[PDB]
């Protein structure tokens, strides 16, 4: 099998550290300069072995093939409305970049408005954020550069789809919202900094800002309205009440779904937006979330988790703002975690729910809360919705596991209200009733029943043959719901494959006790209950060990290089997509500082000790028992990606490689792979997902010698 030769990488064994009495060594922490010519020798060098691996076997190709024809099919946004015209994206299949189109009516014809491809050779170019202004006549849009979360706002006028001179610099993590005058627009930005600020940097992200920007003018003029010098994490988005008269302020400080909720009635600023806002501090702390659903006067509606984990919709009048005097509008349901709350046509609410993984949707009265009619659904998830306060009507989109998705149109001012199929699409090749989606709830270690998702074709003997992909994420209050992916589908109908999908603690899908039973000192709770996915998998004769292959990405590649780290044995392949492996220098790069909401932080002495456990980087360890090895493993990251930086994979395949990768009994590869001009994931071009996913299942195809069936 192995038929190169791993590269020599040089061990900095004077890179001792003292974490509160615990030394620990840290031999590759040379690989955190990305730009040292000993870094990008690094890289070019594991990038030289990997690249003949995965191309060798011409399965690789068959599968490129393959997925390039199912994975070609019409990609459509729900319609959105904005002024008198309405818009929706489209990717006619195979574009790097799906395309914005506008239409003057529902049956007009339409034309492009801003199309993202002809910005790049590559289609590395990619919309990141937008906004229009209050009328629908002006358009504000942010575009990322190689897959960067570094974005640059740009604007243009609708009629005529006018380019204008405007520019913004600096923008990250930032909202997007028009005051409703049409002077200007809020959004967020970080202070100058030396060095690069273009995504293969490493620097932490500090001091962000809320600016206002006055539309025909130059950035260095723009309006300072909000900032936290005390407090450098404190991140401020606004956004603006449905009548235009609240600017409010949704502070944040972390990842948790909590936010300080302050509010600004603009007719009572002195002379309109010239600085510092008159801030009123409804709600000054971080216990809970308040999440802006609509407005009648004074009284406001929010969504919050405030001692109601599964979410409700309380109403707070600004005029009689104690907690006591809130009115519970829909009230928590026992176990159905309400997602998101829209407000259309004035007085309806569109309410979403998860209730067992599975989405909901419902039509509710904005005076009373009551529930007035049931969007009927299949199995699945909604993707996508529109519909604001002054639209009568709504779009929705719908995925499962089977299908591609319908996006359904209902028009609210019939007494009578239909719901009807608004575009649908088929993928030819794919005949979703061959296959069947089941849904069981396993017991991990502690007892608690986790549900898993499993499709697979019909009729299968479970016998223990079968190759199982695996994922799971486990974390951020992060629902993982069905979702039509080709690609896997591609690994069940040519690789004879079964897909599995854990809905393991630290996700919501039961809500904020389900993310909490999976963070922190708990976060060994999201790799038992994965491992028993694993064990369930294996037990009821859906695949067998040396068959079965797990994935995840970030906080779910974490997820997948814990498990090989603590069960090898468990195992035969494992893919780990930009994930976070120092667990205990995260937290120094970029935004990293914002997830130890989730993981802690090694700062702290409780905390080292419970990241110490589980840190991918510090628990490589060769396995006991003669006849186990490490699973075959590879880590994919780009150098781009700023969300979580590549040194993480860097350090971690470099560790792999010296104390496992040299064992005699390793036989299986442990690789890694970096790409150029692409980032954490967002934005992608189609044409880099392909190879992307090409890559994975080659990987998997040659590792566990597995057939393509035609
Ligand atoms: C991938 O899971 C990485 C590593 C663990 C957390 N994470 C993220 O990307 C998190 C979770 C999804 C969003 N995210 C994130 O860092 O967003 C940036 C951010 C914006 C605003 C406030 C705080 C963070």
């Not at 489209?90 to 801003?114: I, P």
């Not at 974005?151 to 005529?160: L, Q, Y």
């Not at 993981?599 to 409780?606: A, E, L, V």
């Amino acid at each position: 099998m192995l038929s190169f030769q791993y590269p020599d990488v040089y061990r900095d064994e004077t890179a001792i550290q003292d974490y509160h009495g615990h030394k620990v060594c840290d031999p590759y922490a040379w690989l955190e300069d990305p730009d040292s010519e000993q870094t990008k020798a690094f890289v070019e060098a594991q990038n030289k072995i990997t690249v003949p691996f995965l191309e060798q076997c011409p399965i690789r190709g068959l599968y490129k093939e393959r997925m390039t024809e199912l994975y070609d099919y019409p990609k459509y946004s729900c319609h959105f409305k904005k002024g008198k015209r309405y818009f929706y994206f489209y990717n006619t299949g195979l574009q790097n970049q799906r395309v914005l189109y506008v239409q003057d009516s529902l049956e007009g014809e339409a034309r492009v408005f801003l199309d993202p491809n002809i910005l790049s050779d590559d289609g590395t170019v990619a919309l990141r954020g937008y906004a229009f202004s209050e009328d629908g006549e002006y358009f504000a849009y942010g575009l990322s550069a190689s897959g960067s979360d570094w974005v640059t706002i740009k604007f243009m006028k609708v009629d005529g789809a006018k380019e204008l001179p405007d520019v913004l610099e600096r923008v990250k993590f930032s909202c997007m919202a028009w005051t409703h005058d049409g002077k200007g627009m809020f959004y967020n930005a970080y202070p100058q900094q030396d060095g690069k600020s273009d995504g293969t940097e490493t620097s932490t992200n500090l001091h962000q800002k809320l600016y206002y920007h006055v539309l025909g003018t130059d950035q260095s003029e723009d309006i300072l309205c909000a900032e936290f010098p005390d407090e450098p994490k404190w991140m401020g988005g606004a956004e603006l009440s449905d009548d235009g008269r609240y600017v409010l302020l949704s502070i944040r400080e972390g990842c948790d779904p909590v936010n300080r909720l302050w509010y600004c009635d603009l007719q009572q600023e002195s002379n309109g937006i010239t600085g510092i806002l008159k801030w009123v501090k409804l709600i000054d702390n971080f216990e809970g979330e308040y999440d802006y659903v609509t407005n009648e006067g004074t009284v406001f509606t929010f969504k919050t988790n405030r001692h109601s984990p599964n979410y409700r919709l309380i109403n707070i009048d600004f005029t009689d703002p104690e907690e006591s005097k809130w009115k519970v509008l829909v009230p928590e349901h026992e176990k159905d975690v309400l997602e998101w709350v829209a407000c259309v046509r004035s007085n309806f609410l569109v309410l979403c729910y998860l209730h067992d993984v599975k989405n909901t949707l419902q039509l509710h009265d904005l005076a009373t809360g009551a529930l007035l009619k049931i969007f009927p659904l299949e199995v699945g998830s909604v993707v996508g919705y529109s519909g604001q306060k002054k639209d009568t009507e709504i779009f929705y989109q719908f995925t499962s596991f089977l299908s591609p998705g319908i996006i359904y149109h209902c028009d609210l001012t019939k007494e009578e209200l239909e719901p009807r199929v608004f575009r649908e699409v088929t993928v030819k090749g794919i005949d979703a009733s061959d296959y069947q989606t089941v849904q069981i709830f396993y017991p991990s270690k502690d007892g608690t029943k986790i549900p898993m998702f499993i499709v697979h074709k019909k009729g299968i003997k479970l016998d223990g043959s079968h190759p199982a992909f695996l994922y799971g994420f486990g974390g951020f209050n992060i629902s993982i719901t069905p979702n039509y992916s080709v690609s896997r589908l591609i690994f069940v109908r040519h690789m004879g494959g079964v897909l599995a999908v854990a809905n393991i603690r630290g996700g919501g899908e039961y809500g904020e006790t389900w993310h909490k039973g999976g963070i922190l000192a708990n976060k060994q709770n999201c790799f038992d209950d994965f491992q028993c996915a694993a064990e369930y998998l294996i037990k009821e004769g859906y695949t067998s060990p040396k068959r079965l292959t797990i994935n995840g990405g970030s906080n779910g590649g974490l997820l997948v290089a814990t498990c090989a780290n603590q069960r090898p044995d468990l195992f035969g392949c494992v893919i780990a997509q930009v994930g976070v492996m120092d667990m205990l220098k995260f937290h120094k790069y970029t935004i990293g500082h914002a997830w130890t909401t989730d993981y802690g932080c090694s700062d702290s002495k409780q905390h080292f000790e419970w990241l110490i456990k589980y840190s991918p980087l510090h628990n490589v360890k060769l396995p006991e028992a003669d006849d186990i090895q490490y699973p075959s493993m590879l880590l994919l990251t780009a150098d781009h990606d700023d969300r979580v930086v590549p040194l993480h994979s860097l350090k971690f395949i470099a560790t792999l490689q010296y104390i496992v990768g040299r064992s005699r009994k390793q036989n299986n590869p442990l690789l890694i792979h970096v790409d150029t001009k692409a980032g954490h994931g967002a934005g992608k071009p189609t044409a880099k997902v392909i190879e992307e996913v090409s890559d994975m299942f080659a990987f998997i195809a040659r590792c566990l010698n597995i057939d393509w069936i035609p």
